[PDB]
Every structure is written in C-alpha cells, then in structure tokens.
Structure 1
C-alpha cells in the first residue's frame, strides 16, 4: 500500500491539472460567449441610437 500511495500521489497531481483545464475551459467559454454577445449588442446600440 505504501508503494501504491507513492504512485497515487503522482496520479492525484495529474488529476489536479486535468480538473483545472476542464473547469477553466468551461468557465472561460461561457464568459467569452457573453462578452461577444454584449459587445455585438453594444456596438449595435451605438448605431441604433444614431
């Protein structure tokens, strides 16, 4: 079990990176989809006001 835990620490160190990529990708993809829509709506609003 001690040898399994030496190996398991490295697996947990890798899962911490896989979980950071999956979480940041999801959060960034949603936030950037809102930022693009709000910029399109904002640039459109400047012309509509004109």
Structure 2
C-alpha cells in the first residue's frame, strides 16, 4: 500500500492539471462568447442611435 500511494500521488497531480485545463477552458469559452455578443450589440446600438 505504501508503494501504491507513492505512484498514486503522481496520478493525482496529473488529474489536478487536467481538471484545471477543463475548468478554465469552459469558463473562458462561455465568457468570451458573451463578450462577443455584447460587443456586436453595442456597435449595433450606436448605429441605431444615429
């Protein structure tokens, strides 16, 4: 069980990196899509106002 925990530590490190990658990719994608839609709506609102 000691040897198994010695390797399980490195397994948990790699799983931590993968969870980091997945979470930041999901949040970045959703936030940038909302910002792009908002920018297009803002320039459209400028043209509507004129």
Q: Same fold (TM over 0.5)?
A: yes
Give the 4+ runs in structure 1 shifted more than 4 A: none
Compute the RMSD of aligned alpha carbons.
0.4
Where structure 2 has 5 or more consecutive residues not aligned to the other structure, the ranges are none
What's the TM-score once normalised by structure 2's chain length?
0.97
What's the TM-score once normalised by structure 1's chain length?
0.97
Aligned residues: 50
Where structure 1 has 5 or more consecutive residues not aligned to the other structure, the ranges are none
